[PDB]
Tab-separated table of C-alpha atoms in Angstrom:
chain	number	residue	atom	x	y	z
A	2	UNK	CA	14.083	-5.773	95.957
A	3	UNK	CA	15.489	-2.340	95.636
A	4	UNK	CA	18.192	-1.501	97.887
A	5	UNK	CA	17.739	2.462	98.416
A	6	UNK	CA	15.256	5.121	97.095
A	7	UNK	CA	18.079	7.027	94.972
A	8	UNK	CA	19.283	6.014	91.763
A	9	UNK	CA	22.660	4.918	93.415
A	10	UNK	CA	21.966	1.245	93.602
A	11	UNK	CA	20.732	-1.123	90.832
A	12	UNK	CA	17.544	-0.725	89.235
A	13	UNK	CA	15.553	0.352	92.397
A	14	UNK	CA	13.332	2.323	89.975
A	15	UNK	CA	12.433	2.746	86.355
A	16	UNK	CA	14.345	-0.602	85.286
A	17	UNK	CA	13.376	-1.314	81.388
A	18	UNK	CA	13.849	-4.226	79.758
A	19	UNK	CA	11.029	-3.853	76.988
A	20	UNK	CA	11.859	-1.933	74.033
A	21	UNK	CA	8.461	-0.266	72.502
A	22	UNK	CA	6.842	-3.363	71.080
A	23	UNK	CA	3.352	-1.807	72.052
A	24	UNK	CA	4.006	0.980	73.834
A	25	UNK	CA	5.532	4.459	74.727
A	26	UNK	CA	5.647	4.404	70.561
A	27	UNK	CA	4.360	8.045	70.725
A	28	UNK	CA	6.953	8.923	73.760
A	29	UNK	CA	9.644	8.190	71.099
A	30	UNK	CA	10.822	12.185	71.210
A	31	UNK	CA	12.583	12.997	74.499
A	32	UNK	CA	13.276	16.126	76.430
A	33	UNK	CA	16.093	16.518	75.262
A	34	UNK	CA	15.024	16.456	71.581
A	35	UNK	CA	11.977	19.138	72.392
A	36	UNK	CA	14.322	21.185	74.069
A	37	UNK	CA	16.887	20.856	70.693
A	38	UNK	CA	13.913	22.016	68.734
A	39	UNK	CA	12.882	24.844	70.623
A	40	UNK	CA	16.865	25.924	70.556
A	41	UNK	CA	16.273	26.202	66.822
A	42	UNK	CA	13.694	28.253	67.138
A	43	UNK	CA	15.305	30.840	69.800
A	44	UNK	CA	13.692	29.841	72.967
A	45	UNK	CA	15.624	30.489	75.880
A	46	UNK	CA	12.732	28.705	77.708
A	47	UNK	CA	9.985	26.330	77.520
A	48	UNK	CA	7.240	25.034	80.123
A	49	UNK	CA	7.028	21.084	81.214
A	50	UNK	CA	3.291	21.214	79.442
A	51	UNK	CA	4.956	21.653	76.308
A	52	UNK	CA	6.294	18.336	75.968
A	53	UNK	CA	3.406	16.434	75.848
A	54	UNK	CA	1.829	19.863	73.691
A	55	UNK	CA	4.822	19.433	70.888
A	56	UNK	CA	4.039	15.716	71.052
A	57	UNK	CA	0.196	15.838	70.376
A	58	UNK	CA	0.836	19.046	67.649
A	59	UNK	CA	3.744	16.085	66.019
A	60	UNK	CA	0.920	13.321	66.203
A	61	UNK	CA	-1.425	15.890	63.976
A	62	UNK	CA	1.394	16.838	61.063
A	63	UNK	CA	2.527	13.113	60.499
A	64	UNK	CA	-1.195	11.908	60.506
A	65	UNK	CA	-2.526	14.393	58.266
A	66	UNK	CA	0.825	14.176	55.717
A	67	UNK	CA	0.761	10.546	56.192
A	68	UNK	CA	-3.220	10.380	55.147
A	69	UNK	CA	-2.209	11.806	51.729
A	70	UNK	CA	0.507	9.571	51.661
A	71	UNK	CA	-1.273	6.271	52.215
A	72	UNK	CA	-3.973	7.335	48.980
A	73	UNK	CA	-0.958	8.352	47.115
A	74	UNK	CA	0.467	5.033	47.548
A	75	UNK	CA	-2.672	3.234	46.971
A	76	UNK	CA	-3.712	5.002	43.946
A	77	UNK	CA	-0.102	3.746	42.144
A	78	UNK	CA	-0.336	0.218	43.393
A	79	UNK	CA	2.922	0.585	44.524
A	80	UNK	CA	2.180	-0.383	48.394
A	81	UNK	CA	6.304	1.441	49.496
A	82	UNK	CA	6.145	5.166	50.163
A	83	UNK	CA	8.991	6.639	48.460
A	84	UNK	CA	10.661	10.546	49.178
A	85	UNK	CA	8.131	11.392	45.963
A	86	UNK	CA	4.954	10.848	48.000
A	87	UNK	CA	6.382	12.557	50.906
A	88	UNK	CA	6.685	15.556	48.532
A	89	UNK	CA	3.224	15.274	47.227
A	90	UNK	CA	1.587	14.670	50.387
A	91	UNK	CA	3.250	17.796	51.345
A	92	UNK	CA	3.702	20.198	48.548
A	93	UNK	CA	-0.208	20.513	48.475
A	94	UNK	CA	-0.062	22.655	51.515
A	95	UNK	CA	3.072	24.337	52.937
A	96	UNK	CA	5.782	22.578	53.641
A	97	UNK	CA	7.261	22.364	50.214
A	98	UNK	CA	10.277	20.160	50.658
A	99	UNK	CA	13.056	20.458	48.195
A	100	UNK	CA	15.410	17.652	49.243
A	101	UNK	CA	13.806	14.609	47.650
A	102	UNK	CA	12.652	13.728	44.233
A	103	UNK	CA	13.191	13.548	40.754
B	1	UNK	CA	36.403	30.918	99.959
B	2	UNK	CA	33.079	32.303	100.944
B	3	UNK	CA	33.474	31.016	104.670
B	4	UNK	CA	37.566	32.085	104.538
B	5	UNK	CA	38.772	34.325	102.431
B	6	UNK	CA	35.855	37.046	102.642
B	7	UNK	CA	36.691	36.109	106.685
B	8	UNK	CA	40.114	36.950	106.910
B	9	UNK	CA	39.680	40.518	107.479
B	10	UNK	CA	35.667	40.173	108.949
B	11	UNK	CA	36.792	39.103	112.467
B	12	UNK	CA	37.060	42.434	113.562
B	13	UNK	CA	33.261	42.985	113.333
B	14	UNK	CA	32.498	39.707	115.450
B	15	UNK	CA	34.359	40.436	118.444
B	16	UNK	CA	32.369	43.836	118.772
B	17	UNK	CA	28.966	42.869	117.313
B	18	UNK	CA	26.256	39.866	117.043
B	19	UNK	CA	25.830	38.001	120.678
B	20	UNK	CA	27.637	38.079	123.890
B	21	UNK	CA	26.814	37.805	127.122
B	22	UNK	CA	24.347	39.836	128.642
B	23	UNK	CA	22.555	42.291	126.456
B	24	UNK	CA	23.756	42.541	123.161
B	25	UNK	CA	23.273	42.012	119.711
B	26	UNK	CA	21.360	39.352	117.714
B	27	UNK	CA	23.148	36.743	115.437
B	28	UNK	CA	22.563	37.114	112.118
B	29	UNK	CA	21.136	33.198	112.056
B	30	UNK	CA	17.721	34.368	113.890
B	31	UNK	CA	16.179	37.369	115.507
B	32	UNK	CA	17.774	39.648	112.964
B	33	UNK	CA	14.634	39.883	111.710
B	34	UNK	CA	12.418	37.507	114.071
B	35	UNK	CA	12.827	40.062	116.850
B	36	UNK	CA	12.801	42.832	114.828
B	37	UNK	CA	9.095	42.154	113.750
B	38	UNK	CA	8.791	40.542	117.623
B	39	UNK	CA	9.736	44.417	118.539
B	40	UNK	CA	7.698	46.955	116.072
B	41	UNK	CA	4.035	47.636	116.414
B	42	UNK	CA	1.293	48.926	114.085
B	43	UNK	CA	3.058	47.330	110.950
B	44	UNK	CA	1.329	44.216	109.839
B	45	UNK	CA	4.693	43.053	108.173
B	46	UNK	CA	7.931	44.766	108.040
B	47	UNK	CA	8.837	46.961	104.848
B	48	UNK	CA	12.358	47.395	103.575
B	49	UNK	CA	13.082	50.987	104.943
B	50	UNK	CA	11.888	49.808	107.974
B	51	UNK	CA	14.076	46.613	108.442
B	52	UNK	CA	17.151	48.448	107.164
B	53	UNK	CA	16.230	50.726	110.418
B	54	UNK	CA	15.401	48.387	113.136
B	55	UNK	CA	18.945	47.217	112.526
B	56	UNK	CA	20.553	50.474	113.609
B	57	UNK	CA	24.225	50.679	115.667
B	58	UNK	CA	26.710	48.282	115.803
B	59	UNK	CA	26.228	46.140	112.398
B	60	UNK	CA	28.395	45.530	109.427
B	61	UNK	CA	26.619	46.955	106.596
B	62	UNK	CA	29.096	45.939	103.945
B	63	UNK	CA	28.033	44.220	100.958
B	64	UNK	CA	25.928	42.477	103.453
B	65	UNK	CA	23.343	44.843	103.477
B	66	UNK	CA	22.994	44.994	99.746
B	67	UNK	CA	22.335	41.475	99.486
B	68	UNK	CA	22.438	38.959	102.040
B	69	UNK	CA	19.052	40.705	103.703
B	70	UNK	CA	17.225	39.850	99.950
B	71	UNK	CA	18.897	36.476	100.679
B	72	UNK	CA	17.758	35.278	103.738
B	73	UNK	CA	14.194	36.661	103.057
B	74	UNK	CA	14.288	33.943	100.496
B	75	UNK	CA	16.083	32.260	102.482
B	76	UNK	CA	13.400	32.120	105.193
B	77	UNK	CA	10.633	32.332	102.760
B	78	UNK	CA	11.904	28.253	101.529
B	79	UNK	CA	11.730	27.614	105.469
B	80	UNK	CA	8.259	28.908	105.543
B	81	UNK	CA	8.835	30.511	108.688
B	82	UNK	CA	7.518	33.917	107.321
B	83	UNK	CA	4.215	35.082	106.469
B	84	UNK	CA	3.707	37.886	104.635
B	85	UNK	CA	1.354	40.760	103.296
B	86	UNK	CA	1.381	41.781	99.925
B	87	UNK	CA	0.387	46.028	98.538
B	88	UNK	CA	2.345	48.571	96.169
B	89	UNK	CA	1.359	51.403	98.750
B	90	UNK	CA	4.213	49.493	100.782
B	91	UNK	CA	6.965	47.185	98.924
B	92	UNK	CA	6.534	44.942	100.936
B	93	UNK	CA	5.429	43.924	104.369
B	94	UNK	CA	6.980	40.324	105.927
B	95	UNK	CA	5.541	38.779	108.858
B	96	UNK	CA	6.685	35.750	111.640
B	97	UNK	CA	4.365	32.611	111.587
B	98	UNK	CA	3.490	33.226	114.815
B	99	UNK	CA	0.631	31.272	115.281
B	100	UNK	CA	-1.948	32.734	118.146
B	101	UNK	CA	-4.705	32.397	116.040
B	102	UNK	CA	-4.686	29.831	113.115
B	103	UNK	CA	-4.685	30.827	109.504
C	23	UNK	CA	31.245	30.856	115.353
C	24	UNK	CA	31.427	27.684	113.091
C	25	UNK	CA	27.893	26.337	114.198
C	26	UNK	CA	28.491	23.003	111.671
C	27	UNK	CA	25.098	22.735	111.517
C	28	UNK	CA	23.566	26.009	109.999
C	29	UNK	CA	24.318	26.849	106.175
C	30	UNK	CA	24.047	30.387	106.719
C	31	UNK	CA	27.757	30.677	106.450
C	32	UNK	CA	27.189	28.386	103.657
C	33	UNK	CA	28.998	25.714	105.514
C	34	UNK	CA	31.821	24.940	102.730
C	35	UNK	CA	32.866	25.721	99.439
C	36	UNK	CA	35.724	23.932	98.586
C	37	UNK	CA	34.284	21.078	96.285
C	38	UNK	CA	31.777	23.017	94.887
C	39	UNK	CA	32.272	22.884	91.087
C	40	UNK	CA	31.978	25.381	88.251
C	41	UNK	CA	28.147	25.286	87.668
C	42	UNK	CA	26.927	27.858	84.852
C	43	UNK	CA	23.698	29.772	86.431
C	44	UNK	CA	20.390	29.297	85.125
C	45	UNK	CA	19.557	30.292	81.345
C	46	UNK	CA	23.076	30.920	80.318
C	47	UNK	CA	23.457	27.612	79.042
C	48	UNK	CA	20.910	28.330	76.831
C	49	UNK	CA	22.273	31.700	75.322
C	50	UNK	CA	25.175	29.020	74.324
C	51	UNK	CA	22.797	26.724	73.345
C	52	UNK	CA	21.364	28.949	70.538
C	53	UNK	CA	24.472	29.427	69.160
C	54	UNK	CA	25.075	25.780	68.399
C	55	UNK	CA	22.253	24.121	67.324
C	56	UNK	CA	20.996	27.144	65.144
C	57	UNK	CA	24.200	26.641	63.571
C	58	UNK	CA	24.284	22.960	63.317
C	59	UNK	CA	23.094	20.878	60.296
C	60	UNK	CA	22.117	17.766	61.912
C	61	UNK	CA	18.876	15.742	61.799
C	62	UNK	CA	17.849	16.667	65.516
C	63	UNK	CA	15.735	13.471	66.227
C	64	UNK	CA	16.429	9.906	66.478
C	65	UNK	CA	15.400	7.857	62.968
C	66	UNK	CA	13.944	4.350	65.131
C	67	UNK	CA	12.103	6.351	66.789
C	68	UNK	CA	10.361	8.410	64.392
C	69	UNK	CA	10.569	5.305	61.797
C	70	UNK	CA	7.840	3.080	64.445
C	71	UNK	CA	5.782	5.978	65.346
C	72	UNK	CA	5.246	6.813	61.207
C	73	UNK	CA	4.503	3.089	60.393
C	74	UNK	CA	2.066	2.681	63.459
C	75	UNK	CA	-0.403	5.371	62.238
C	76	UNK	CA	-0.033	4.338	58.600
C	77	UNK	CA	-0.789	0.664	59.821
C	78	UNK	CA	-4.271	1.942	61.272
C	79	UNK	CA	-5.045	3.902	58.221
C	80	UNK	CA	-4.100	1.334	55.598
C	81	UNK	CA	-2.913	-2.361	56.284
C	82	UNK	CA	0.639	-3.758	56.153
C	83	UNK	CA	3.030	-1.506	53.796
C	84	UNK	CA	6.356	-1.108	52.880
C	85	UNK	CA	8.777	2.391	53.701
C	86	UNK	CA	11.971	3.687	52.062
C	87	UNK	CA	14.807	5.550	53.932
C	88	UNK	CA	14.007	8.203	51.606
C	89	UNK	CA	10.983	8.459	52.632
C	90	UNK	CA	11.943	8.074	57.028
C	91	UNK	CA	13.788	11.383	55.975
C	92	UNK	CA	11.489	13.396	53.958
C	93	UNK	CA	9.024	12.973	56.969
C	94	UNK	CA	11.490	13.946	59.475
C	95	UNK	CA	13.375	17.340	57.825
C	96	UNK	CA	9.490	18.684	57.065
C	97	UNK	CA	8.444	17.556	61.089
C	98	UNK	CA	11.331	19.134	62.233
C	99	UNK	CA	11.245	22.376	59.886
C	100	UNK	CA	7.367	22.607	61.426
C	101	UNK	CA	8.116	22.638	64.961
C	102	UNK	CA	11.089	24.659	64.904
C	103	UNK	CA	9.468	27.087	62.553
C	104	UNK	CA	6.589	26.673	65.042
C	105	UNK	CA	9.403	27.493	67.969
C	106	UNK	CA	9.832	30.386	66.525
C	107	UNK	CA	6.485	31.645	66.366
C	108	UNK	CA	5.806	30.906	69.640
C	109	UNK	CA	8.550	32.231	70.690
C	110	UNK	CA	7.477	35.726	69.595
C	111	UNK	CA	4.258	34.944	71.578
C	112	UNK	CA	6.337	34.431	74.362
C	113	UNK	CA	7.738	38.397	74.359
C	114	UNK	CA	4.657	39.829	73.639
C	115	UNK	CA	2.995	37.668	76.560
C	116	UNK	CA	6.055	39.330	78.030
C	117	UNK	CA	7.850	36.344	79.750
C	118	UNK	CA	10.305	33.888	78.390
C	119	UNK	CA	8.499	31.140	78.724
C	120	UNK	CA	6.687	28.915	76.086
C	121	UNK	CA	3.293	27.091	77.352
C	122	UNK	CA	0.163	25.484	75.301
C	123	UNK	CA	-1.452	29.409	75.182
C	124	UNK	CA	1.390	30.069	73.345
C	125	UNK	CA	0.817	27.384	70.740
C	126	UNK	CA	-2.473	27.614	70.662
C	127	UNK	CA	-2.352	31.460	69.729
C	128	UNK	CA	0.618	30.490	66.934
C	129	UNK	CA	-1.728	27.203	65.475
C	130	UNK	CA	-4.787	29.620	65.502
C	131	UNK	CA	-3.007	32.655	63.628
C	132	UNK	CA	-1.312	30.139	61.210
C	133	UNK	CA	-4.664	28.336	60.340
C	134	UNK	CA	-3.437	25.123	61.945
C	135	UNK	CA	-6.321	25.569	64.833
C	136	UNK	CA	-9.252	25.012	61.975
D	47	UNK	CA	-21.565	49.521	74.540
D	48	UNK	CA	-18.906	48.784	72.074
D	49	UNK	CA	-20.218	45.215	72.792
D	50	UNK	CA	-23.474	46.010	72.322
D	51	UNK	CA	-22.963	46.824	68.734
D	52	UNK	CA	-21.047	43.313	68.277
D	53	UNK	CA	-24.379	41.903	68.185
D	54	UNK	CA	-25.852	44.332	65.196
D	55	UNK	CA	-22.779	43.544	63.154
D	56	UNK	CA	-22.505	39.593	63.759
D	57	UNK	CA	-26.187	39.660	63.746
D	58	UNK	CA	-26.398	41.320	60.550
D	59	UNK	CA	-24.115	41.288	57.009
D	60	UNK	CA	-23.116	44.834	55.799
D	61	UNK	CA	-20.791	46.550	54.218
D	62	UNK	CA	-18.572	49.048	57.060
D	63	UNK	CA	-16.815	51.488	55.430
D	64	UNK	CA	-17.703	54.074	53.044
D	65	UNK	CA	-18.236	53.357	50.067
D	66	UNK	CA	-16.974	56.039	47.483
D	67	UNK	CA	-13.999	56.471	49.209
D	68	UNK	CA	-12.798	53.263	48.972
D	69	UNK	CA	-13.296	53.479	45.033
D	70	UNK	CA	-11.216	56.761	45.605
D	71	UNK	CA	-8.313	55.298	48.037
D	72	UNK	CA	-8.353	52.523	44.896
D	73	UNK	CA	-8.260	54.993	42.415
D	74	UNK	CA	-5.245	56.775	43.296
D	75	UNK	CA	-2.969	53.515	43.728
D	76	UNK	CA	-4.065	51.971	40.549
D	77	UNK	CA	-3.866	55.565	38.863
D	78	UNK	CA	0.160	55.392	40.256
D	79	UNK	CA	0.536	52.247	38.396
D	80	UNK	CA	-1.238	52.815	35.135
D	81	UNK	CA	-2.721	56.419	34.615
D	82	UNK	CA	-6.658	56.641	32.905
D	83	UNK	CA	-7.694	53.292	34.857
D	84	UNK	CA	-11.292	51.981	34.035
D	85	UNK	CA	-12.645	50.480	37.285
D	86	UNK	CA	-16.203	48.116	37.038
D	87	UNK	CA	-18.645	48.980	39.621
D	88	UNK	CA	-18.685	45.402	40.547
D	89	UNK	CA	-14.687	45.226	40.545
D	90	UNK	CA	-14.380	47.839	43.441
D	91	UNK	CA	-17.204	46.435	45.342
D	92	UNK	CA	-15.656	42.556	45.075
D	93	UNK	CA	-12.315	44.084	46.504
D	94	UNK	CA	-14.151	45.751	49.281
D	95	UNK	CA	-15.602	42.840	50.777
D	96	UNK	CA	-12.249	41.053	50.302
D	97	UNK	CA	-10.924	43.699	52.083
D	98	UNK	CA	-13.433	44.148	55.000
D	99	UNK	CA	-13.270	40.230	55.491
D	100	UNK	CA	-8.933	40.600	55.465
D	101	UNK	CA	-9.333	43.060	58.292
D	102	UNK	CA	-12.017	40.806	60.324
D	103	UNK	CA	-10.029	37.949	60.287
D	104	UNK	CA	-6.817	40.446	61.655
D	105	UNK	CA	-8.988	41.906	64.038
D	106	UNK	CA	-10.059	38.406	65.289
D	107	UNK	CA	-6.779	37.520	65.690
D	108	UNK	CA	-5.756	40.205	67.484
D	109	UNK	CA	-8.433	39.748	69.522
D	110	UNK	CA	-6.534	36.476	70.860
D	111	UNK	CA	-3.206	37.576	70.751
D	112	UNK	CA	-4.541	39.948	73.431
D	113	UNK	CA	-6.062	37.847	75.713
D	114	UNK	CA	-2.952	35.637	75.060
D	115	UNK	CA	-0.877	38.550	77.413
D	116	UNK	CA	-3.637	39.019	79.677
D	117	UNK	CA	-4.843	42.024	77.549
D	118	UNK	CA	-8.329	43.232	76.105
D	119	UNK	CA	-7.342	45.503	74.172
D	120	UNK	CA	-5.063	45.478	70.792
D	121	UNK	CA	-2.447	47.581	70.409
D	122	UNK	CA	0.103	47.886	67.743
D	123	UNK	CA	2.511	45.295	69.126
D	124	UNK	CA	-0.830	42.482	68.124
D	125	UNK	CA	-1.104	43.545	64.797
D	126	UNK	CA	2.400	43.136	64.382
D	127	UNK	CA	2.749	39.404	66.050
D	128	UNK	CA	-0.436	38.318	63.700
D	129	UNK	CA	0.944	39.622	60.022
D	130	UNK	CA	4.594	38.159	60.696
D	131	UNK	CA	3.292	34.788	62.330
D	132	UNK	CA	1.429	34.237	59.061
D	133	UNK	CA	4.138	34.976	56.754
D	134	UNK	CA	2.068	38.345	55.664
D	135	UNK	CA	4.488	41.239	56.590
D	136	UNK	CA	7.557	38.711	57.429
């Protein structure tokens, strides 16, 4: 099929067609985007274990925000998170957003 | 022009210096410091004083010198071509892979 | 002695373009993005990742772009704000670089790590 | 030696610093604020082991910001990563 090792040719390697239906939903953050981050923060330079690290620490934050979030929404019978549960799910501890709500 | 410009006045040191026929000089591509280490004794690698003397007479010392020896010590350490010892009593002391006896 | 085949002489440098060394980019790179304003990651992206863990804790709900962006500004405040702390782990580990014992130190400190 | 003792103090709950002059180091910065201060018995003796426990968990720390740059022991560089990573001193 492929026509050459390299990337010169078409699609000898890595050829996607399927758009995370099922999978690589946590692998939604890219280099890139970790690296952007870390610029942020004033780091010159990061490791290649901290890509997966930053992704497993982001996987922790939403889940336990998010675990708030779903009681919030159930408690109110209003089954849509809105910006006000993000703030209540989050003002509890830290992370006291301004932007959103009232 | 690395290969050019920094050339234009540097062909006065080749027609005097690296090989020619009969005894003579080493190229700077090998046995600058492959026979160097081939020549001393009692070392166990080569340190940086020493080097910088085993390449007495005849040799441009330049900017050369001051960098292109770090260079191909890098250079040769990507090859693998050089085995080395490591100490702070000595800086340093760099080695051929000559293999008589296997590591 | 053009040996052609030997890049001691480095062979040629005629085409070789303008390429910044290692780390400067990044001393540029500061300056920008500490700067910009910009939500740094992509919404899709963040909006299936959200709605897959809620889906396992509770069944089928609804989201509001209000709420895609809450989540992301507080995400990205926490990992830059984590950066940060990290990267003063990084000097006094004395190196540049930013690896898992340097997060692991910050999340401990921070009470994350409990 | 010094980890001998670690076992006598996790091993066993005490109070480790003196006592009376904590009541006096107390003393003189309350006196600063408001001269003539009344201080309970039971007051000065609640802020000690507040106190005691504020430096234990600092000292833990420290302890693994240490072995973070291949260190054992803490210096005054650790004590100041710890307070400004937790929003204490900065």
């Amino acid at each position: 099929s492929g026509r050459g090792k390299g990337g010169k040719g078409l699609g000898k390697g890595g050829a996607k067609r399927h758009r995370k239906v099922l999978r690589d939903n946590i692998q939604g953050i890219t280099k890139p985007a970790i690296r952007r981050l870390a610029r942020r923060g004033g780091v010159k330079r990061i490791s290649g274990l901290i890509y997966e690290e930053t992704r497993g620490v982001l996987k922790v934050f939403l889940e336990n925000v998010i675990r708030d979030a779903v009681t919030y929404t159930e408690h109110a019978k209003r089954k849509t998170v809105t910006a006000m549960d993000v703030v209540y799910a989050l003002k509890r501890q830290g992370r006291t957003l301004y932007g959103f709500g009232g | 022009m690395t290969e050019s410009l920094v050339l234009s006045p540097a062909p006065a040191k080749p027609k005097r210096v690296k090989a020619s026929r009969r005894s003579a000089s080493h190229p700077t591509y090998s046995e600058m410091i492959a026979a160097a280490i081939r020549a001393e004794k009692s070392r166990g690698g080569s340190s940086r004083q020493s080097i910088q003397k085993y390449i007495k007479s005849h040799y441009k010392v330049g900017h050369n010198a001051d960098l292109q020896i770090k260079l191909s010590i890098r250079r040769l350490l990507a090859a693998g071509v050089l085995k080395q010892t490591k100490g702070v009593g000595a800086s340093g002391s760099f080695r051929l892979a000559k293999s008589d006896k296997a590591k | 002695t053009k040996a052609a085949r030997k890049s001691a002489p480095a062979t040629g440098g005629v085409k070789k373009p303008h390429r910044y060394r290692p780390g400067t980019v990044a001393l540029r790179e500061i300056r920008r993005y500490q700067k910009s304003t910009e939500l740094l990651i992509r919404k899709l992206p963040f909006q299936r990742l959200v709605r897959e863990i809620a889906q396992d804790f509770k069944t089928d709900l609804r989201f509001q772009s209000s709420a895609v962006m809450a989540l992301q500004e507080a995400s990205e405040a926490y990992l830059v704000a984590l950066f940060e702390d990290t990267n003063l782990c990084a000097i006094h580990a004395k190196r540049v670089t930013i690896m898992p014992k340097d997060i692991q130190l910050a999340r401990r400190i921070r009470g994350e790590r409990a």
